Amino acid sequence: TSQVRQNYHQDSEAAINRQINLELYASYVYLSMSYYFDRDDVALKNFAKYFLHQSHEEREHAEKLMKLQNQRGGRIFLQDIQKPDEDDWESGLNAMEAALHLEKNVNQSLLELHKLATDKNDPHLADFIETHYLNEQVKAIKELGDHVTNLRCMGAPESGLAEYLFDKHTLG
Amino acid sequence: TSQVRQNYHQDSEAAINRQINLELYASYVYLSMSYYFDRDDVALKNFAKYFLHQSHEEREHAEKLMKLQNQRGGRIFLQDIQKPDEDDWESGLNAMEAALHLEKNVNQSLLELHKLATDKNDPHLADFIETHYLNEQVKAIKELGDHVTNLRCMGAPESGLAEYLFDKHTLG
Amino acid sequence: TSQVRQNYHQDSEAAINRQINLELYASYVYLSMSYYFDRDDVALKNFAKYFLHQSHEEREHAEKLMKLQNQRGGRIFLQDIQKPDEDDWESGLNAMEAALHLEKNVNQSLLELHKLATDKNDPHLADFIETHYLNEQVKAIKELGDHVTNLRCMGAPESGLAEYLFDKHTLG
Amino acid sequence: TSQVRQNYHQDSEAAINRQINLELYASYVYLSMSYYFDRDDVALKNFAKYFLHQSHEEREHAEKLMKLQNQRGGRIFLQDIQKPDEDDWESGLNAMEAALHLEKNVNQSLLELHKLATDKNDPHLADFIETHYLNEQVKAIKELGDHVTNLRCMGAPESGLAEYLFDKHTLG
Ligand SMILES: [Ca+2]
Ligand SMILES: [Ca+2]
Ligand SMILES: [Ca+2]
Ligand SMILES: [Ca+2]
Ligand SMILES: [Ca+2]
Ligand SMILES: [Ca+2]
Ligand SMILES: [Fe+3]
Ligand SMILES: [Fe+3]
Ligand SMILES: [Fe+3]
Ligand SMILES: [Fe+3]
Ligand SMILES: [Fe+3]
Ligand SMILES: [Fe+3]
Ligand SMILES: [Fe+3]
Ligand SMILES: [Fe+3]
């Protein structure tokens, strides 16, 4: 149907649409986390900044997947963006752990998208996933794990002083 | 009860949560339009840029309303962002017309929020709506109307030459 | 009658005079708190700086209300500035809590001034209150609530280590 | 017998020589199109410049492939660069269509080279093809499609004005 489409399986196009939805959902979760930390009864402003930045970055990765869909002659098909599963994120340690899990899920779905690209012999799609998503997911997961470890060693969440100082020193 | 809450009725808290979801919906619609215009068989780069900037601006307003919710002692409650009821926006003129109607609906809902706010003797929320949304939406609807009028006067949608030149001279 | 007076009822003139005295009272309380934190047996320099700046800001608002009184054709009538009902503010957390309540009271009195202003069909005074006081007091109360929340979460007032570090990392 | 040769299959060597020829040919086609638009009876200056830049870039791609052949220890075997199919390219839209077809063909043989390379477990050759050729081809095809779409929507080739305005706005 598209004059530019070449070597671009319809499974790959649907999988790209689903991945776009996933990146937008991650962006939504991060947004809710961020403004949770903006509440006057939490007031961890750098946690808020950190999560809001990650939310904009997930939105950027969704926009790049939409660009990629148009680049391949695919056609973008958007779904509802589900609300996050929680509205109260308990603590900075618990937010960081939910984000760790969220990035692990996103990575796993990216790895399935890669294996689909490879078994459909679409090396452009495989290398796009590699170059723009795979190492970024690994760096994100490593950094979240670092934060989780530090918060836990400092005595979070029972130690609110721990979360305050982490907000000041690591997220500052 | 919040330690900062003062003169913030529950109706306006809920209407703010609804307005947050509405502004997130608006940016979703603009994002869909933007990448429709990035398709290989549409290829109007400045229409795409225009709607992507509108998208980001709507997201910034949603975040501003979240900030106000937290500022007022309210609780942010996020619901699903409904997918745009359209996939193919047909043309630049039709996209501008749909944006005009979207913004008009957002505007009347903002006025209903303001009417509720002044009904409940909450002058900070009313002036906030005024200050940060009312004239912004008026200018936005006026701009979109100008865009619609120009594209129509130029021969859109029958002549793709009109849409091409509007994309270059106005959206450029 | 003034040569410039127009649509300035006597109730709002008197309420402006009362608000002038209230804002002078607020700055007096902040000044007392500031130098409490300068005592040799308290010695939290940035708490002191913070409350002295709040004091000067309240004095600037009192002077702004005086300027508005003169602008509207009214007569400034000054009454005694009542001494703060406390000498010893006990701790940084308790000082922040007292400031939170002070500002909350000032805010509801500002809303009563606005309600009177819109009762009397005086839209300039109402928008002036909005513009120059309503969102300022909202931001102030939110900031003080954040401060209270952090100091509490950090272990104040039991651990003077929390107050020391808050003084360094947040008020610094 | 190359002292540097390692994991470089004789089929990979030959396929690289064929790709070198194909890129020099793409360069020749672009050169012929560019000087067709420099004709006094066509005289579309920016079409000319665009296709000259495409020709210089295609020959840089050829030289990168020759350098790759040497890095891997294979041997450059060059062949005739065939003259293009057409001397007269008819119009700007027809030229853009021929360019789109030509680049889709270059892309198909690049994908075949990647399949060969991964069939021979030559991951260096694969990743080289990926990062220096495959996304550049995907972007080139997307861009030519966009151009064709605009020429068509504007009413080319029947409207000489459409191609004039496209020359001035998109290509200038
Ligand atoms: Ca790769
Ligand atoms: Ca429809
Ligand atoms: Ca006492
Ligand atoms: Ca020949
Ligand atoms: Ca690879
Ligand atoms: Ca280019
Ligand atoms: Fe991501
Ligand atoms: Fe991510
Ligand atoms: Fe808006
Ligand atoms: Fe808007
Ligand atoms: Fe004040
Ligand atoms: Fe104040
Ligand atoms: Fe090439
Ligand atoms: Fe090329």
From Swiss-Prot, chains A, B, C, D:
It comes from the Eukaryota. Residues 6-155 form the Ferritin-like diiron domain. Fe cation 1 binds at residues 23, 58, 61. Changing residue 18 to A: Abrogates interaction with NCOA4. Fails to localize to punctate lysosomal structures. Its EC number is 1.16.3.1. Keywords: Acetylation, Cytoplasm, Cytoplasmic vesicle, Iron, Iron storage, Lysosome, Metal-binding, Neurodegeneration, Oxidoreductase, Phosphoprotein. Its main location: cytoplasm. It is linked to Hemochromatosis 5: A disorder of iron metabolism characterized by iron overload. Excess iron is deposited in a variety of organs leading to their failure, and resulting in serious illnesses including cirrhosis, hepatomas, diabetes, cardiomyopathy, arthritis, and hypogonadotropic hypogonadism. Severe effects of the disease usually do not appear until after decades of progressive iron loading. This is Ferritin heavy chain. It comes from Homo sapiens (Human).
